[PDB]
Amino acid sequence: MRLGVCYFPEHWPSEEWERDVAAMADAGLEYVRMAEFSWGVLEPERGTFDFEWLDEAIELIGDHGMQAVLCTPTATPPKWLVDERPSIRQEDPDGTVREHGSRRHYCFNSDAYREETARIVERVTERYADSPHVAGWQTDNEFGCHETVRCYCDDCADAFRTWLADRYGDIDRLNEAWGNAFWSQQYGSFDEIDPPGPTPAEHHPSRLLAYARFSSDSVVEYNRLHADLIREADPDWFVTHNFMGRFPTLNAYDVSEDLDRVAWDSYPTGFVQDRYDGEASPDQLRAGDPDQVGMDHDIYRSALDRPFWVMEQQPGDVNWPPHCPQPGEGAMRLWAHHAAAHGADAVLYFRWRRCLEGQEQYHAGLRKADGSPDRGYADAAHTSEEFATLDGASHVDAPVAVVFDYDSLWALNAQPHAPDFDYWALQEAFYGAVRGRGVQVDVVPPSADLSGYAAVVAPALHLVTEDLADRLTDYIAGGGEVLFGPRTGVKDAENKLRPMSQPGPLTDLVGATVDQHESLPRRLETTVRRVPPVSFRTWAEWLDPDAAEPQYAYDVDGPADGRPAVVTNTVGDGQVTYCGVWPESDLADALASDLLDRAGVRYAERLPDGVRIGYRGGRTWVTNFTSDRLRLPEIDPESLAVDDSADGIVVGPYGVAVIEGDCVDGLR
Amino acid sequence: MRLGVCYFPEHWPSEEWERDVAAMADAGLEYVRMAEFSWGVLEPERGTFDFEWLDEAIELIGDHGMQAVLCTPTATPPKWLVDERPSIRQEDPDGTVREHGSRRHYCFNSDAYREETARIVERVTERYADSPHVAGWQTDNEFGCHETVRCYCDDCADAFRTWLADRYGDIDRLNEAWGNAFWSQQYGSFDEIDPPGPTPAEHHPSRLLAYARFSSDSVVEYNRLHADLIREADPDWFVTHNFMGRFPTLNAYDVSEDLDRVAWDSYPTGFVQDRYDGEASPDQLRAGDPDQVGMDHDIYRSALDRPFWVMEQQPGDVNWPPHCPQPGEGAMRLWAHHAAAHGADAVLYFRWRRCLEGQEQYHAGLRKADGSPDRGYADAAHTSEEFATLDGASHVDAPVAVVFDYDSLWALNAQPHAPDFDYWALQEAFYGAVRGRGVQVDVVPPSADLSGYAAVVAPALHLVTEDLADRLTDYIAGGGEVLFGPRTGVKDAENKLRPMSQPGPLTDLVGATVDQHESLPRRLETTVRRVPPVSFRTWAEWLDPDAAEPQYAYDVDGPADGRPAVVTNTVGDGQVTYCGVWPESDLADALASDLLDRAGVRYAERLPDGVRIGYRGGRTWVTNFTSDRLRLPEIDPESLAVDDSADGIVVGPYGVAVIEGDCVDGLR
Amino acid sequence: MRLGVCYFPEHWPSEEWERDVAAMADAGLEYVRMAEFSWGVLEPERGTFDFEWLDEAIELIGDHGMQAVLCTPTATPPKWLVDERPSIRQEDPDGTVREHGSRRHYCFNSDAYREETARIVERVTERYADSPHVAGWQTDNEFGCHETVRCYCDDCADAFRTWLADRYGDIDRLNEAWGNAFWSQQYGSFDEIDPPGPTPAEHHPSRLLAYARFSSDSVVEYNRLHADLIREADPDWFVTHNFMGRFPTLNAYDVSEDLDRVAWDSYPTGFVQDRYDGEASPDQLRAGDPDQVGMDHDIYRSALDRPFWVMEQQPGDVNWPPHCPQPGEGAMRLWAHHAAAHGADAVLYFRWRRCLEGQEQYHAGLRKADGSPDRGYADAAHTSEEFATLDGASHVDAPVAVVFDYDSLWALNAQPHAPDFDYWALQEAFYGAVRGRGVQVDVVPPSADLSGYAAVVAPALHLVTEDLADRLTDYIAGGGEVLFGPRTGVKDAENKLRPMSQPGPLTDLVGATVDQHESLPRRLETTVRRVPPVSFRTWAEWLDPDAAEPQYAYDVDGPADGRPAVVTNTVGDGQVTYCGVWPESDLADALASDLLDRAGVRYAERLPDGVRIGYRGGRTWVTNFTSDRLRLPEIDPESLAVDDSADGIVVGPYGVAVIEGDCVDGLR
Ligand SMILES: [Mg+2]
Ligand SMILES: [Mg+2]
Ligand SMILES: [Mg+2]
Ligand SMILES: [Zn+2]
Ligand SMILES: [Zn+2]
Ligand SMILES: [Zn+2]
């Protein structure tokens, strides 16, 4: 709908200021976000303040018809503050303090930093509460980036001890809940508990999961401090945060419980590089992967059951990934329309102009170093016009749900049982099989209500609380069916095994138990056939069908030969399928298409690997991350978003096509 | 002969206790080992003790006819003790203290820990000295695991200084023995010597070897403290320890000098993964490598010249190696019979039931999580019956010897001169060539007497003491012949070069000197022909035949072309062959078969790669780690151990076959 | 011209002393360098001194007709000094002190060490000022080796603060020159600046470049202390230093500004191993790469515009590289003649005899361990005779120049924008293309005067000072043409971007601007054709020809398809070509041959990959690093240096051929 850009008047002289806001008006960007790293300029020394620049900045943003979203400067305390109160910095487990010289050099549990966040944010919000045309506020900047969610300092130790006391009540319930008899790891009292440090072997899984939950909850409380004082300033303002893609350390659900709108930063070409399982391909090197960006879009939309923003959007070549080839022609228009299809009503590009200045010189902006426009500006203008023309897009609703569980993520990160195992890649297999049929997908936590969904897929439900278990049993008994992936129903809320066999509380919600599991180097032939041969990847679980009906068996020809691999069971009205195998493309597509068959939804035929389509409101969007070409027959030119006989429409490389009418179709 | 299991009543409720000991009686396991990690349960706080559970435990083990072997709880001091006396923990070279949160968090040289080992072990042995049916005692648990042999704390510094003074007498003998003039590294006094810490370049080889010897001797004295007080408790008891496979940091010979029986922990599928040189193959992924497990069996048997135990045996899937595929059908029966062939009279499986509890949840037991039996239980029962039926097996004696020298191992670990060089792999090449002919092999230190051996193979004798040198000269003059590998006769007892050329004290016990040596990336063609072409690996030493007779020359076609590679010489009665080359399979087999020719022993024809046979007492065992099948004609069905015309016997995948009669044969 | 050896009488008994100096006379080595690591022997305790050995040593070196070059023992302070004043040692960023146990364990900024360098060097030079036959002095030993240029201790912190104050005057000029507004990184005062330590993300580029310049300048001042007191001792003496190959941390130009002769250590087989981009080939494993050793030869010759020495030369197999295969037959004669061709008048081999002693036992010498000669001795004798026969070789002058900029090196090391990017490899591509035509090349800093050069090549001029810019414009306007590589004209003296587009101050000295740049994984097809198809590597810069004339365009067929890749422009008299691409062998050779066409120099036809020729004085040298054979027709046998009809001369594997007459030729 609306577009924007992340501006930094801090770096540029004030002569360029109004001409640049004028260009930002020319492009059609109705939002401008600044003041992230402006603490050092505002307070050069303690007691001295320099607000006026931002005032004029806001003025010009309001002079040209855009509303500016401001942010707390907490991400970068200046050097005088760090030298003044060194206790604010964090420590990694062996105790080395993460110094100044970059961003994110503070600890979420140091009461000192709480005091001075209070001071600085109080003074910056009271300057702007009622009068000016600021739109809302965003918390610090990318909470927990550079692995700053978990600190092992002594302030975190005290916070950990009281968090533990609050969770468990007394020491004996902790010892029996984690079960500390193995390797005589019982705690005599809560003080005897230290944040995990260097030790000869692995750390206790319940201990590590407790510390992960503790770190994420610490940052949730810090964010609530932020949001409390922001709401204190002006009741109309929204509070929001910019999260990151494929980020494991911060539970965005609970922190989003404290805000009004959700935002995140997407850089497709960079994240397709970061050992996205397998070698990043050229078209991926220039456009990214539609499914990684898409799952992040869905996870941040379904946070509040409301549309989201993308607070930072890749403008061109960036600096952090190993290589950064030039993205394809119109890749930014492509990403904007991708986010718009996935639910974003605002897309703000980072940044306005390439910074000549810091350790991000190799990060482009919508403008060059000259003040000349970069490719980002042109594509931003084009997507602006098309966003205007296509309607006041509604909030998508997904018929299918995938349950994303940060606790399962952390617990398996602690115990992968394979070097090539990754929760992100598993959820990606299942979710991308569902999206390869063309549906809109919702990814949610166990907290959400599973009613109102045709089908649900739970690739990893590692820890199953029994309330969650009977909720799913009643959903499958009364409503649609479910597809569970491998490694679900293994541990409890305390990351502990059950006296029963896998999948514990779900064992009767499926037709089988699990004899045992094995982890496989991806060097062995790993196939399944149906009881045609498809291959699976990295993981196998032998199914003991006690209730009923194996579907796929192992043609692996090892010691698991001929044993059930996939299973189905019809408990009452509605079904349940269990996949004890990490499926490759074909098997996952078969499972997805069949579950979609069972739930009367309108899956399109197998869309190509770099082609994704989504129905928002009434219109439907086809985003082409492939650089070849696409041709959809069966649809004549009545499309709203088109580029500059009736044989369909042709969607060029990195192009979008918005069409109305919720299709069941194929293409190229 | 007898079977067992490592039980932990600590984890399980006492209602399952007698039913589980009843099942352990059903399987036929006459030994039960517990109390390893029970310090935290016994002494929850200082002065408070909780013995009674173990009492009843022992009672039930004695109620059902099995003798229980107990162990000191020293491996895991509880948190209250660590917080009480933090000085007990270790430090790695840069000085970071290895905290609590795992096992093995103590230092062998901290007098504090000596005091409290005295306290706890005194109190636990006096509880059981004369009266109950405990069988013997095992020291802590896997001494030095997780790299805990070498600590760099200050207590170790004092222990190192006095160990050095005891070895060298005065500072000047140390300086001249290590020769500290290079890089002006001379010590003015013994206090000027610090345990090795961070330094810009490598560390002195004599210094590092001194510290390795010092760490291992420190743990030998700790073990002698243990054994002294155990023998103090009951004169009948045996003292033993559980060592590890392919473990370089602890000299098991000298610590075994302090005990009565030797035991070790075998997990074949896991250790075949740990960069066992080359990619672990599928049949290896499910059965392991017969030669690695076999050399460990031999090294721990020949420790006391007595049979050994395998205190921990893989029950199924385990947790530590990167991947853990399900082992083959009957792999545990296979490992039990493998150890029985190699000399083990007791084989105790770890553990009884998969622990639901600690950081080893992914480690199976003989029973499932349900209390249901796992594959391990069934295979344990089957091997129990066959162990009963085949006789009261004798102690094997080997005709051939391989000299394993921990000092050579440490010295070459400090100076590999190649990234792909490994003492384990070299000894494996030679030993496996000998075993591929079907013999029983003894692996011993230079301390042992070399008489009573048809032939001897010394792959790496890096440090040759002159007493050892004339012992070998008299052995070769009066008795059998020897085969020396590369890098023998290079340094003295002080890890220092000789003024002479290689191999120093042995130069006249062989026909040649060594012109020079080269290290080779395994990318170049590395062949030898005899003076048909076989390939060698990673190492070459040009031989200068001064006395006599090159056998193999270099067809490598480099600057070493045509120079002697292998050599033979007949000093008196009996011969000596020197292999200045790391031989691949074919060359090593030729050398092994020929040395066996020279010593009138009964080598069988080349057995397949995953097939190993051994003659214990009167019976001989063929263990098949291959999953194909095996067929031995020339032997009709009179076999003792067989699975459930006369064309031989067929040994299926992962099967054993015990036959009587010391064969010279081939197979499949 | 003259040969030598690096002797250590410290290790050997004095009985071998005169026989070894006699052998050194036999070989013809007129220089002997000792006293590097002799501090521990000289001063065993403080106040006690033991000079006499060296006296006799010098005597014998003078008794047999050779002049001995001595060195300060500063590289290895003994243990008593380190224990006495521990503050002398260095610290790496997280603060761990680099202990004793190796060499180079001192800090260049600790005033303590300045005091005791003064003490020890004063006492060692006054012992020898006027009377004896020592030739000159060499500073410590390989300054900064094992990464000891940059220390992060507190003494370095104070030195850094005052160096910064001296460079910038006040804090505000530093903040605006580095531009510290990004991530609020401004400094309130110079004390607020700490040497870079652990921080969650990257460090500021200007900050890191400042610290690199600071470390190198610190060692320049330490070297000036050394040289000042050496010149104080005897006015006739020369001061020199031994630098290293491919060494990035020490600016040899500025330290050479303080000495009279330049020396360096060449080990070709070892450095061709150290991830010299690509797999080191067999002939490289035995001879090295002529271009890496050659560029180091040129960089150390052009330091003072005078000939150089090679203070350490590989004698045979060495210890530091991963593998060390035996070098080819006569490889040392080959290296000696290679250095002689490149300008070395003295070549001193390290070392005399393999040290039996320290952590370098696996490093050969010219003699074996026996005191027997090694291959090095024979080849040293042969190259001695030929050096005598061929004339009193002059100082080479190069017609072409390559600008090597340590600041560009450090700045791109901080921001490679690619994992496979390396300043050494880029300069190697261009320089080796020039040498593959057979010319002599000079590699110099921007400090040197560019007049007197037919053509100049600047592969990376990352930071262009405007004085440098107008110097190059006037050179191209009045004289020859230039070839600029990628990533030149990007930042200023402060490592900051310009408000203009690339290449900033050079934008009108070339026909184009730079649209943008991309980094490429070497997995994509990366070609160019001329406006036949050659391939490029790892880097591309789209050229916007505003002034004139693209030569090569992109046949890569991506989003950069058809855009100019190489460009040429004729500003006045003389031309300029810009290569926005990292060229592979063929493209680089085309560019080199064409620039040589433009400058009327006598390039020979494409010489093979392991063949290098150079014209020193009147004679010209062809060094064959290839092991095949070479045949030069068109030249009959009148050659001066030849090995033991008229169809040319044949140069065998690893042979030299010195011929007179400055050729334009081809070969094999
Ligand atoms: Mg700690
Ligand atoms: Mg230390
Ligand atoms: Mg610091
Ligand atoms: Zn912290
Ligand atoms: Zn210690
Ligand atoms: Zn320092």
CA B165 to the chain's CA centroid:
31
* Sign of torsion over alpha carbons C249, C255, C257, C261: negative
A-chain residue closest to B279, CA distance: A523
The closest CB to that of A99, out of C194, C496, C501, belongs to C194
Identify the helix (H) or strand (E) that includes residue A81: helix A79-84
Three-state DSSP state, A217: helix
C78 touches chain B (CB under 8 A): yes
Here the tokens at position B132 are: 């109950």
The closest CB to that of A40, out of C184, C199, C418, belongs to C184
Residues 547-576 of A with CB under 8 A from B: 558-560
Catalytic residues of C: 142, 312
B516 touches chain A (CB under 8 A): no
Q: Which residues of B touch A558 (CB under 8 A)?
A: 282, 286, 325-326
Q: Are C195 and A86 in contact (CB under 8 A)?
A: no
Q: Which residues of B touch A192 (CB under 8 A)?
A: 79-80, 83
Q: Give Cβ neighbours of residue B611 (< 8 Å, ≥ 6 apart).
A: B290, B622, B623, B624, B625, B626, B630, B667, B668
**B5, amino acid identity:** V
Residue that the structure tokens 């039931």 belong to: B353
Instruction: Kindly tell me the burial class for residue C65, based on how many C-beta atoms sit within 10 Å of its own C-beta (0-12, 13-18, 19 or more).
Output: exposed
Resolution of this model in Å is 2.5
Ligand 4 center from residue A194 Cα (angstroms): 13
Q: Are A503 and A525 in contact (CB under 8 A)?
A: no
Contact C368 B501 (CB under 8 A): yes
Ligand nearest to the CA of A222: 4
Q: Are B252 and B447 in contact (CB under 8 A)?
A: no
Side-chain half-sphere CA neighbours of C156 within 13 A: 30
Distance CA A458, CA A503 (A): 13
Peptide bond into B333 cis (omega under 30): no
Q: Give Cβ neighbours of residue C162 (< 8 Å, ≥ 6 apart).
A: none
Here the tokens at position C562 are: 């058809």
Chains with 3 or more CB pairs under 8 A to chain B: A, C
Identify the helix (H) or strand (E) that includes residue C29: strand C29-34
Q: Give Cβ neighbours of residue C154 (< 8 Å, ≥ 6 apart).
A: none
Beta strands in C491-646 (DSSP E): 512-519, 527-530, 534-545, 552-554, 566-572, 574-579, 581-583, 611-616, 619-624, 630-632
Distance CA B337, CA B656 (A): 7
Distance CA C300, CA C607 (A): 24
Chains with 3 or more CB pairs under 8 A to chain C: A, B
The closest CB to that of C521, out of A323, A327, A356, belongs to A323
Ligand 4 center from residue A102 Cα (angstroms): 17
Shortest alpha-carbon distance between residue C577 and chain B (Å): 41
Distance CA B169, CA B162 (A): 10
Q: Are C327 and C372 in contact (CB under 8 A)?
A: no
Distance CA A129, CA C401 (A): 64
Q: Are C195 and C218 in contact (CB under 8 A)?
A: no
Ligand 2 center from residue C146 Cα (angstroms): 19
Q: Give Cβ neighbours of residue A178 (< 8 Å, ≥ 6 apart).
A: A204, A206, A207, A210, A494, A495, A496
Shortest alpha-carbon distance between residue C182 and chain A (Å): 5
* Domain edges within chain B: 1-395, 396-607, 608-668
Distance CA B521, CA B539 (A): 9
Distance CA A98, CA A107 (A): 10
Q: Give Cβ neighbours of residue B394 (< 8 Å, ≥ 6 apart).
A: B616, B617, B618
Distance CA B57, CA B51 (A): 10
Contact C99 B415 (CB under 8 A): no
Residue that the structure tokens 């018929």 belong to: A399
Beta-sheet pairing, C659-660 with C619-624: antiparallel
Q: Which residues of B touch C327 (CB under 8 A)?
A: 559
Side-chain half-sphere CA neighbours of A57 within 13 A: 25
Nearest to C161 by CA among C211, C219, C107: C211
B-chain residue closest to C363, CA distance: B417
Nearest to C456 by CA among C437, C479, C438, C489: C479
**B396, amino acid identity:** V
A370 touches chain C (CB under 8 A): yes
Q: Give Cβ neighbours of residue A56 (< 8 Å, ≥ 6 apart).
A: A14, A17
Ligand nearest to the CA of B154: 5
A497 touches chain B (CB under 8 A): yes
Contact B282 A519 (CB under 8 A): no
**Is A361 one of the annotated binding-site residues?**
yes
Residues 191-210 of B with CB under 8 A from C: 192, 194, 196-205, 207
Beta-sheet pairing, C512-519 with C346-350: unpaired
A-chain residue closest to B316, CA distance: A516
Instruction: Kindly tell me the burial class for residue B618, based on how many C-beta atoms sit within 10 Å of its own C-beta (0-12, 13-18, 19 or more).
Output: exposed
Q: Are C70 and C33 in contact (CB under 8 A)?
A: yes
Contact B11 A501 (CB under 8 A): no
Q: Give Cβ neighbours of residue B119 (< 8 Å, ≥ 6 apart).
A: none
B94 touches chain A (CB under 8 A): no
Contact A180 B370 (CB under 8 A): no
A498 touches chain B (CB under 8 A): yes
Catalytic residues of A: 142, 312
Residue that the structure tokens 């890191």 belong to: C208
* Sign of torsion over alpha carbons C643, C645, C646, C651: negative
Ligand 3 center from residue C153 Cα (angstroms): 7
Residue that the structure tokens 């690096």 belong to: C6
Distance CA A537, CA A504 (A): 24
The closest CB to that of A200, out of B41, B83, B147, belongs to B147
